[PDB]
Amino acid sequence: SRGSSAGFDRHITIFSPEGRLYQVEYAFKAINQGGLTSVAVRGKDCAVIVTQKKVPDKLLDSSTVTHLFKITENIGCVMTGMTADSRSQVQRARYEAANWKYKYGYEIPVDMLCKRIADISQVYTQNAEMRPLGCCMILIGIDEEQGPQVYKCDPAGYYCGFKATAAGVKQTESTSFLEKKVKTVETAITCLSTVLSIDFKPSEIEVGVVTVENPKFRILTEAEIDAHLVALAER
Amino acid sequence: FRNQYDNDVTVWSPQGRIHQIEYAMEAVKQGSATVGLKSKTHAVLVALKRAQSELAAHQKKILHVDNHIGISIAGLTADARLLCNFMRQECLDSRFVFDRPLPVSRLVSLIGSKTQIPTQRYGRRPYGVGLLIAGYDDMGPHIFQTCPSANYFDCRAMSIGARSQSARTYLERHMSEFMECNLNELVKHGLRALRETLPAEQDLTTKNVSIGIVGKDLEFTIYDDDDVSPFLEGLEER
Amino acid sequence: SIMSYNGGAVMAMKGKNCVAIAADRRFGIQAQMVTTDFQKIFPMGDRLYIGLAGLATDVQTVAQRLKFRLNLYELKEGRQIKPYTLMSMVANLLYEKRFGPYYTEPVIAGLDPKTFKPFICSLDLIGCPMVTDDFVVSGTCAEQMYGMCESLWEPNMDPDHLFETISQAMLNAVDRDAVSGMGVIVHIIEKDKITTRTLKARMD
Amino acid sequence: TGYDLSASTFSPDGRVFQVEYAMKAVENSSTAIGIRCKDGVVFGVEKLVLSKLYEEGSNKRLFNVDRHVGMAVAGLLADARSLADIAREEASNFRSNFGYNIPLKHLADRVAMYVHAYTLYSAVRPFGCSFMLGSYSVNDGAQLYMIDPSGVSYGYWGCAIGKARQAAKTEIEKLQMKEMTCRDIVKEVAKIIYIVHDEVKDKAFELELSWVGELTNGRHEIVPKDIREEAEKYAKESLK
Amino acid sequence: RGYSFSLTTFSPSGKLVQIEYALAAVAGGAPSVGIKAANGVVLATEKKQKSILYDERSVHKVEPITKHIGLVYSGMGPDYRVLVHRARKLAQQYYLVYQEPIPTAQLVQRVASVMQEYTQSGGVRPFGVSLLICGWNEGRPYLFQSDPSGAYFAWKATAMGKNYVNGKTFLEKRYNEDLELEDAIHTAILTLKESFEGQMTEDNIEVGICNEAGFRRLTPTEVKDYLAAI
Amino acid sequence: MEYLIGIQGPDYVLVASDRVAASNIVQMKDDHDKMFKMSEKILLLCVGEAGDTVQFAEYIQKNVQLYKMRNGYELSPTAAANFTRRNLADCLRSRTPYHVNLLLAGYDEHEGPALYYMDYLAALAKAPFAAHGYGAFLTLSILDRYYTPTISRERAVELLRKCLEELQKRFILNLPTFSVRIIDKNGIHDLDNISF
Amino acid sequence: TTIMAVQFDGGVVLGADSRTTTGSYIANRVTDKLTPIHDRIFCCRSGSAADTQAVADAVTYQLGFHSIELNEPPLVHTAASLFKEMCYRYREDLMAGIIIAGWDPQEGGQVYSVPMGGMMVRQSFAIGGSGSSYIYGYVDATYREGMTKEECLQFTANALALAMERDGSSGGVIRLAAIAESGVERQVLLGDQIPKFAVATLP
Amino acid sequence: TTIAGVVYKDGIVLGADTRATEGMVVADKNCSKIHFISPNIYCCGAGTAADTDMTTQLISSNLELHSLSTGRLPRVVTANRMLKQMLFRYQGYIGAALVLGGVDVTGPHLYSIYPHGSTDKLPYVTMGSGSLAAMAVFEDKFRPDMEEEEAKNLVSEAIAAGIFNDLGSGSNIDLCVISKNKLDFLRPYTVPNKKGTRLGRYRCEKGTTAVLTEKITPLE
Amino acid sequence: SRRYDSRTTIFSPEGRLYQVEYAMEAIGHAGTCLGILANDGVLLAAERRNIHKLLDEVFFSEKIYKLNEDMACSVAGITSDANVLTNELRLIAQRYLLQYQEPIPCEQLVTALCDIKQAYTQFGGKRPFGVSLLYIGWDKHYGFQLYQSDPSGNYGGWKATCIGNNSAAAVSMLKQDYKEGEMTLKSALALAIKVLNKTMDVSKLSAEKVEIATLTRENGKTVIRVLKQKEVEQLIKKHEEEEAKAE
Numbered sequence A: 001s002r003g004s005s006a007g008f009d010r011h012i013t014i015f016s017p018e019g020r021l022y023q024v025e026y027a028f029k030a031i032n033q034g035g036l037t038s039v040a041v042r043g044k045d046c047a048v049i050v051t052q053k054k055v056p057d058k059l060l061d062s063s064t065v066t067h068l069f070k071i072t073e074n075i076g077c078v079m080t081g082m083t084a085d086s087r088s089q090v091q092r093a094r095y096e097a098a099n100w101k102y103k104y105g106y107e108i109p110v111d112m113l114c115k116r117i118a119d120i121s122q123v124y125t126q127n128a129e130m131r132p133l134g135c136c137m138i139l140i141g142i143d144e145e146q147g148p149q150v151y152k153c154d155p156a157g158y159y160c161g162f163k164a165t166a167a168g169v170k171q172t173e174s175t176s177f178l179e180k181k182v183k184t185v186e187t188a189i190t191c192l193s194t195v196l197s198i199d200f201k202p203s204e205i206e207v208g209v210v211t212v213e214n215p216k217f218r219i220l221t222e223a224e225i226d227a228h229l230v231a232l233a234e235r
Numbered sequence B: 001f002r003n004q005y006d007n008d009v010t011v012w013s014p015q016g017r018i019h020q021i022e023y024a025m026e027a028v029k030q031g032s033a034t035v036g037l038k039s040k041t042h043a044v045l046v047a048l049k050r051a052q053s054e055l056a057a058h059q060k061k062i063l064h065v066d067n068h069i070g071i072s073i074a075g076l077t078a079d080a081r082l083l084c085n086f087m088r089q090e091c092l093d094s095r096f097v098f099d100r101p102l103p104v105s106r107l108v109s110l111i112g113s114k115t116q117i118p119t120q121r122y123g124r125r126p127y128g129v130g131l132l133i134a135g136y137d138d139m140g141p142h143i144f145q146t147c148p149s150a151n152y153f154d155c156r157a158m159s160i161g162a163r164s165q166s167a168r169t170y171l172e173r174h175m176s177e178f179m180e181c182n183l184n185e186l187v188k189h190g191l192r193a194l195r196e197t198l199p200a201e202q203d204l205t206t207k208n209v210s211i212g213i214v215g216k217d218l219e220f221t222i223y224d225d226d227d228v229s230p231f232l233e234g235l236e237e238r
Numbered sequence C: 001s002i003m004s005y006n007g008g009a010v011m012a013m014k015g016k017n018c019v020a021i022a023a024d025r026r027f028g029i030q031a032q033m034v035t036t037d038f039q040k041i042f043p044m045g046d047r048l049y050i051g052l053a054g055l056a057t058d059v060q061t062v063a064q065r066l067k068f069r070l071n072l073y074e075l076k077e078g079r080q081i082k083p084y085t086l087m088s089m090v091a092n093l094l095y096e097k098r099f100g101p102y103y104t105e106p107v108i109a110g111l112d113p114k115t116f117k118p119f120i121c122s123l124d125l126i127g128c129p130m131v132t133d134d135f136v137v138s139g140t141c142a143e144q145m146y147g148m149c150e151s152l153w154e155p156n157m158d159p160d161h162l163f164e165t166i167s168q169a170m171l172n173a174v175d176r177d178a179v180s181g182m183g184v185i186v187h188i189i190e191k192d193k194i195t196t197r198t199l200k201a202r203m204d
Numbered sequence D: 001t002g003y004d005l006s007a008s009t010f011s012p013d014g015r016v017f018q019v020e021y022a023m024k025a026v027e028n029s030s031t032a033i034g035i036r037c038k039d040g041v042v043f044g045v046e047k048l049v050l051s052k053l054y055e056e057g058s059n060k061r062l063f064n065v066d067r068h069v070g071m072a073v074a075g076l077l078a079d080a081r082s083l084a085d086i087a088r089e090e091a092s093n094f095r096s097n098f099g100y101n102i103p104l105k106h107l108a109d110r111v112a113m114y115v116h117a118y119t120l121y122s123a124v125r126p127f128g129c130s131f132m133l134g135s136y137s138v139n140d141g142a143q144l145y146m147i148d149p150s151g152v153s154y155g156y157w158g159c160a161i162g163k164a165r166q167a168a169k170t171e172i173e174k175l176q177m178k179e180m181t182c183r184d185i186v187k188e189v190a191k192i193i194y195i196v197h198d199e200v201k202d203k204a205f206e207l208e209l210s211w212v213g214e215l216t217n218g219r220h221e222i223v224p225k226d227i228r229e230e231a232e233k234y235a236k237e238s239l240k
Numbered sequence E: 001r002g003y004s005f006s007l008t009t010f011s012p013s014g015k016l017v018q019i020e021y022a023l024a025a026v027a028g029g030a031p032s033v034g035i036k037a038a039n040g041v042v043l044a045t046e047k048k049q050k051s052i053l054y055d056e057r058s059v060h061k062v063e064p065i066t067k068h069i070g071l072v073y074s075g076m077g078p079d080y081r082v083l084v085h086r087a088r089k090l091a092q093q094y095y096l097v098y099q100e101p102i103p104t105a106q107l108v109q110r111v112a113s114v115m116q117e118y119t120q121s122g123g124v125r126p127f128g129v130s131l132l133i134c135g136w137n138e139g140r141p142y143l144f145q146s147d148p149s150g151a152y153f154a155w156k157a158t159a160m161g162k163n164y165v166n167g168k169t170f171l172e173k174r175y176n177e178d179l180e181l182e183d184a185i186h187t188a189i190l191t192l193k194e195s196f197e198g199q200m201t202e203d204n205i206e207v208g209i210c211n212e213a214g215f216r217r218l219t220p221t222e223v224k225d226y227l228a229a230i
Numbered sequence F: 001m002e003y004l005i006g007i008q009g010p011d012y013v014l015v016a017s018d019r020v021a022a023s024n025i026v027q028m029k030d031d032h033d034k035m036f037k038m039s040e041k042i043l044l045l046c047v048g049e050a051g052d053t054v055q056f057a058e059y060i061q062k063n064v065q066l067y068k069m070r071n072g073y074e075l076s077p078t079a080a081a082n083f084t085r086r087n088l089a090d091c092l093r094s095r096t097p098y099h100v101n102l103l104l105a106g107y108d109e110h111e112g113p114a115l116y117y118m119d120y121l122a123a124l125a126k127a128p129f130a131a132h133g134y135g136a137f138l139t140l141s142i143l144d145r146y147y148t149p150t151i152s153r154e155r156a157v158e159l160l161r162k163c164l165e166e167l168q169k170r171f172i173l174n175l176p177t178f179s180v181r182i183i184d185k186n187g188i189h190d191l192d193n194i195s196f
Numbered sequence G: 001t002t003i004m005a006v007q008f009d010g011g012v013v014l015g016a017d018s019r020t021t022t023g024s025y026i027a028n029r030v031t032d033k034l035t036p037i038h039d040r041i042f043c044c045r046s047g048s049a050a051d052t053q054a055v056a057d058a059v060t061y062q063l064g065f066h067s068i069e070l071n072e073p074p075l076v077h078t079a080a081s082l083f084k085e086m087c088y089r090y091r092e093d094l095m096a097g098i099i100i101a102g103w104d105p106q107e108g109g110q111v112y113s114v115p116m117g118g119m120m121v122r123q124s125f126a127i128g129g130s131g132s133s134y135i136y137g138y139v140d141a142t143y144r145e146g147m148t149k150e151e152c153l154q155f156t157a158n159a160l161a162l163a164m165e166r167d168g169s170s171g172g173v174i175r176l177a178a179i180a181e182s183g184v185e186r187q188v189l190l191g192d193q194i195p196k197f198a199v200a201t202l203p
Numbered sequence H: 001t002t003i004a005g006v007v008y009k010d011g012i013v014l015g016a017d018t019r020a021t022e023g024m025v026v027a028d029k030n031c032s033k034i035h036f037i038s039p040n041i042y043c044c045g046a047g048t049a050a051d052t053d054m055t056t057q058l059i060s061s062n063l064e065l066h067s068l069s070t071g072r073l074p075r076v077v078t079a080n081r082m083l084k085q086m087l088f089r090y091q092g093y094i095g096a097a098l099v100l101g102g103v104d105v106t107g108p109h110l111y112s113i114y115p116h117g118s119t120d121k122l123p124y125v126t127m128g129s130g131s132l133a134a135m136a137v138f139e140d141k142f143r144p145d146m147e148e149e150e151a152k153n154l155v156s157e158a159i160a161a162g163i164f165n166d167l168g169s170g171s172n173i174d175l176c177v178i179s180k181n182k183l184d185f186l187r188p189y190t191v192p193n194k195k196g197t198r199l200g201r202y203r204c205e206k207g208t209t210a211v212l213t214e215k216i217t218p219l220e
Numbered sequence I: 001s002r003r004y005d006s007r008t009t010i011f012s013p014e015g016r017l018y019q020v021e022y023a024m025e026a027i028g029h030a031g032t033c034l035g036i037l038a039n040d041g042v043l044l045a046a047e048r049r050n051i052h053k054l055l056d057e058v059f060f061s062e063k064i065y066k067l068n069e070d071m072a073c074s075v076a077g078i079t080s081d082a083n084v085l086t087n088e089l090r091l092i093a094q095r096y097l098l099q100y101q102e103p104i105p106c107e108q109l110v111t112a113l114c115d116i117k118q119a120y121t122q123f124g125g126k127r128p129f130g131v132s133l134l135y136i137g138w139d140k141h142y143g144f145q146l147y148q149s150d151p152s153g154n155y156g157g158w159k160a161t162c163i164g165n166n167s168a169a170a171v172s173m174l175k176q177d178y179k180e181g182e183m184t185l186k187s188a189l190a191l192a193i194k195v196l197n198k199t200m201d202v203s204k205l206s207a208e209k210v211e212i213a214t215l216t217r218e219n220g221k222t223v224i225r226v227l228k229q230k231e232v233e234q235l236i237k238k239h240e241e242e243e244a245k246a247e
């Protein structure tokens, strides 16, 4: 023990001598390969997601460069990590939500959607023939009884609901920033700016929101993002 | 740097290669040489046949697929028969459904698709055979080449198998003549190219040459043994 | 009718801390009697019995397949099955064959293995359970049996009075049915014993 | 590595080397480019002629995947042809099920998810190809997508794949393609292929050109022979 | 698809090392405790809950299976959720056939048999969880443990996860038969306090109880009350 | 129509069957045997639909013999009867039902003689005597009239004869000869055909 | 049942009676036969209630998922195609006569009929159900190219009222919906609000 | 059978008779036809008794798994969907005709569910062989927003109409009252029918029945 | 896939099946389990590994399983594997009863389970079950019987045997003390204790550390009982009295 290894425990999802799953641990490192960080925060009235939008090229159609996705009309998500893996998990989420509504006659709760995706990821940590997906999903929506919700699931199949959270390269620094504070849209954007040390242009982040007044998932335009950046700048 | 990457067709090497595909292609390079070429009106195949010993018959190299299509093979015999049987079946299905011959380029596409599948699945292997395909349809004569990689090529002329580089050099040298050649001239060119693959002391004989021809007024026909004699004389001595 | 091909009659009846279950003894094929000692009531426990009327082949198959399931249950659970639980096990067995049913309509009679409370029920051929506090009947002379039971049954009968009542209800009901009879067997189930009797009966 | 034999195995740094190796097969192939402009999409491919024995047209790297959709490929050509068949089937199934022509973005996303499925398992290998899809319609305008062996899919103003991708992108960046027509852009495509072609290492190539736009009424088509030849003449004379 | 060969096999000394290593995952998990009182059962567990940021109510470690059975674990959370879902399904399958709630021991046997499968079936690893299962039936309380091998044990009291050896010796000193549920809750919390670190609140522990009325989680306010005295 | 009869005495079981195979208006065989030896002390007598009768009886026969080879001893008559019933019942609602009516006669060391009746539905009844076929309608009452449980074998053969003579007198079908066998502790014995 | 839909410049009007019968017992006298399939796409249902509810629920699921994937409002023609595919494929096991009508930004107000058997045709206006037989003449005589929304609602209400008078299998209230770029406006005509036409009693 | 339901101001009232017949003979005089679905949802059943029993049991069980997972009280729409999708799949061969009522986060809801899988959401419904008699009562007397006691009266009057006018219906009236704050499962609610008092005394002595054989087996 | 396969069902170069041998080592470390046949019955006696603690005592035994009316078994080895096999034994026994309407003869039940164990050694690529079993029974063909099976799918019939910890030493003691044709249940029991006393090297033998089950015939019916702790303490006491008289 202390980093020990036997047989194929670094190659497939079997236990190491300490009871670790190295392949799952490596899937967390895969999340950071993309070099991005995302932040999410809930208050009483709304839940918000913000992530970096890096468009180094310009030969890109920047309207197709997004990590924000609509799952249903009332559930939004930000993906962090390997892009193709992420898109796959978004597709699965969309399917699960649609199937839930068809079978049960009401919209899937955000906590149930997160749990289902997490349970699907769990399988990949226990069956040897496929890898985990190297991505992390953060979901937002309004629950009719509990108000705004933010949920995160990961490649280990853990999930939780949060007051605020983060994912990607600066997850730990975002977590410290948000912990200190917790002891909404401006908090999210300030957290991300602080831990990256950037001071953003409106084209360098994306923002999505759900509110108790307007439960439909909405992606802010550049102009709407700029009204927040300017309001902050004037402290 | 090579051994862990060379046994499974599903393992990419660090250089972006698949060694099992490259190794399957060595099966074709070690097959006896065959040549294919075309004029405006005919497609011809010419093949050297190997006899294992002096008392064995020479191995067939040229196979009938349909009235309008035949093939010459190089590489694993059993894979060649499997692929030939697939081609035959696709041709029969086209005539059954549409009452017309399967266009040759469409058949080749089907071979590409079929032969690609095992290159991507664990525990399967590439086909260890290369084909030269002679055909005639509404777009005229054709010579195609298929490979264990599942790639295929539309050819003015081609040679595959052992010492086929020599044949290819002859073909490039004379290819501006082929379109306008009568059938006799075209077959002669094929035989001259094939003869370039031989050790200096060996010659084309009625025992080691096989010929396949298809064209505008000629269904795919195979010429062996005494039937290749008209074509062999012929022929400027080396 | 499929259910009248072999004929036959079963009934169960509740008393004061006792139950009774009875059956005719005829195995016949349409008009022809074949034997007069055909078993229709089967033990499922020391104080728990099932009676099956209907198509003789299925009477036997259901009793045997049920015993297979019950034996496994008792080995796994380490206890005797409760009467209500056996009812549910039988219902599940019959309803598996919802679209090609067994042609048998069981009655169950017993005492709870721990509390000794009386239980009786019947089920239709696809496993609809009916629990009652008085009596249940099944067979080709159900109407005749209802007539006798409605007229004679009383609450809280002692074992001797329960015996006479179930016996008279069976004997007189089957004597108005061409394809039931050739003898009547009766089991009286009490906390401390089982009493089994065959009755003096018409053999026509 | 030790860690680079299966697409079901992460390396300790979180890489899937089998996918990276498949990307190396693409990066060894000659260059293809796509450019979206005001009224359509134009593709061009540096098609190396490995033998003068091949017909002019052999090993096409440009495909019609639906009447309105073209596909341009680089990498292992058997894998690319397989993906073109997957794309075609997806487009055909879409029309049968929904009753209209598949939107380019949706086709790209569906084929990308198929490519992605081959990056998770020891049972199969990643495709050794990258490809572009291009379309035009009056309702959706011009659209150009590119999909790589990992299954990532993005939309582009201009794109290049294969061995001179970076050199090509730097030339594409000099064009104001948003304001240019397909008939202008073909020339530029030809020019850029000639610039990035390494005539010392690999003599002989064919230029392959296709387009889809207002001028083709939203149909993906080969560039007509006379226009290709005037584009080549422009590219050659621009090179000196 | 699926690998069809076992990933757990016998070593030359007769050990199933993947099961031993699954047990090491359990040993490094957060502590859990179970105590069978005369009139009920308590299950208690520590939340390995960093961050103020967690919504502590959003996921529960102490989970109902039926009206009368509940569970907790030590080890890998996501593996636990698999077993919770299966246990719930097993309990309903039983109820459909027998029309009686599943006896605690029957539920444990069926869940243990699932865990056994994952030590032998193709292309999977064992579960990295041990379960503590409580219930009430035949007028009597039950407490069971089911381990990664599929072995199960009936306990009067026990601990699992980090510092379990000391938790069991703490319970051996403190448990007696005729003890009541309210007292047992207290001693279960004291057992967690033995290996806690960092001040207990009603938000970083979870407690569930089982008696004649059924299984239920204690509310945060109920736990806060018991935490006064500790 | 085919006739089977069995009569169980204290320590034996006597069985007989007609020897006719008929088709349409003709007898096509007059020495047909409807009995199948399952083991040293068990006979299965089988009648019913063509094809089904032999296929079923021979399947049972092979499986009874297999049990003996696998285990080193034989199935009891009772166990063999229940095996037979299980198979027939299991087939009843399948794609391959067997339309066969049977008697099984046996002797067990410890339990003595047994006679079992089964119909095509697979209802199984143990009986002191039984018969199958239209001929049973004319003979069962003779058995009811004259049988006793202690009936000797020399009397049982006379009782059997009276039944067979009744068929010659009163039954509309031509059944002129019958196979007769008896089973006891010493195995299966062939008796003289009873012929008219 | 009687169902109907009618195109205008910028939208559609849909209507139905409200009667569901088993034999000649009225099991529901206030049935809602106009079912939303998406924001601006409805179907009008006739034939077996089990079949049309099952098919409508399935299409709603299919179209919802499609619309999320495309991130765009669905086409009316796509909704109709999905109904058609299901009604055609399962034509031997369904008794379903459907009208699909709605609005989308590409083609505006549109009406499709998917009658029993699963053909699909776009129409200016469509009628269906058992009661439609009695109003072919009326609709043929009354229809005019270029009708306004308020004229199309009147036309529909009048046609349905006529059918309901004559068809034993139709009756109750008239449910109407108008769909346009602005949304969906639903209303019920009941009792004295239902257009009235005298019985031709004798002079 | 007569089963029925109404939506009243604060909830749902369900009702049922208690006769089960086999052919034209009463088998059960006290059959329970109001089935548990969840603590806030009940379902009356008519049609083929095994099918209504097994169908309600299955959906109740699947709903319990659902609520165990969600941690929320189930919705009436969910029970409706599960029931109707299953009945549809079976093409009317499961003969369950159901009146489903409950109260969820969106308030009171009442559905009729038919064997082929059609459902109707309505403020009052009836099913079974007595359903027209019960419906006549509802058409004549239902008003929206009735108080609890008025609604209970109305439903029992409707069940009584079936009891007295349908040969397929009889014995007692059971009700189930469901609101946000309470569930009253009232079995029996009313007992309009009683067997006549017995006039002739039989009392058969010991030995009246002649016995041929006897075996006593002592137990435990 | 080929890279990660253990190849559990192949021969080694000396014709050995290594997984079977390694399973046999697991069994050798498990609780001592013995079986003795007598004229009037058969017994099983097993070391308990649920060796006490705060353990709760809820079933009638730890390692003794009733299989049907006429048979029981005990196990040594992986407990979860034993649970799978004992369930399967019960099913096989009920299938046989269903088919024949008589109880499965003892040797046939053993054989049927052993064919399953054997299959796990020959195909499927799974680990074998890590269990040896002792079976006790009565049937009408051979009366009182004792079998042993192990993970190879081999079995044999025994008058007396032992599996699990110190089995070799236990079998020596049995060879020397067992009286072929002359053992009663009373004397077999005395011997069982003598043997467990010598082979339990975990301290002075105690009733809490053993389980004993007897199988007898009474009035045409098989009786299977697990001795209560009172009876086991008495047998241990009689053994300790007898070792004193030995002087």
Ligand SMILES: [Cl-]
Binding pocket: A098, A101, A102, G057, G060, G061, G064
């Ligand atoms: Cl939906």
Ligand SMILES: [Cl-]
Binding pocket: B030, B031, B032, B073, B074, B075, B076
């Ligand atoms: Cl060759």
Ligand SMILES: [Cl-]
Binding pocket: B075, B076, B077, B078
């Ligand atoms: Cl070869």
Ligand SMILES: [Cl-]
Binding pocket: B147, B149, B151
């Ligand atoms: Cl190639």
Ligand SMILES: [Cl-]
Binding pocket: B028, B029, B159, B160, B161, B162, B164
């Ligand atoms: Cl070559």
Ligand SMILES: [Cl-]
Binding pocket: C065
């Ligand atoms: Cl069964």
Ligand SMILES: [Cl-]
Binding pocket: C069, C070, C073, C089, E097
């Ligand atoms: Cl069962």
Ligand SMILES: [Cl-]
Binding pocket: E002, E003, E004, E005, I001
């Ligand atoms: Cl495998």
Ligand SMILES: [Cl-]
Binding pocket: E084, E085, E088, H068, H069
């Ligand atoms: Cl769950």
Ligand SMILES: [Cl-]
Binding pocket: E064, E215, E216, E217, E218
């Ligand atoms: Cl709770």
Ligand SMILES: [Cl-]
Binding pocket: G018, G019, G020, G026, G028, G029, G030, G170, G171, G172, G173
């Ligand atoms: Cl109406």
Ligand SMILES: [Cl-]
Binding pocket: G096, G097, G098, G114, G115, G116, G128, G129
């Ligand atoms: Cl129609």
Ligand SMILES: [Cl-]
Binding pocket: G046, G097, G098, G115, G116, G127, G128, G129
């Ligand atoms: Cl219609």
Ligand SMILES: [Cl-]
Binding pocket: G001, G002, G046, G047, G129, G130, G131
């Ligand atoms: Cl209609």
Ligand SMILES: [Cl-]
Binding pocket: A105, H077, H080, H081
């Ligand atoms: Cl619904």
Ligand SMILES: [Cl-]
Binding pocket: H001, H002, H046, H047, H127, H128, H129, H130, H168
């Ligand atoms: Cl009814």
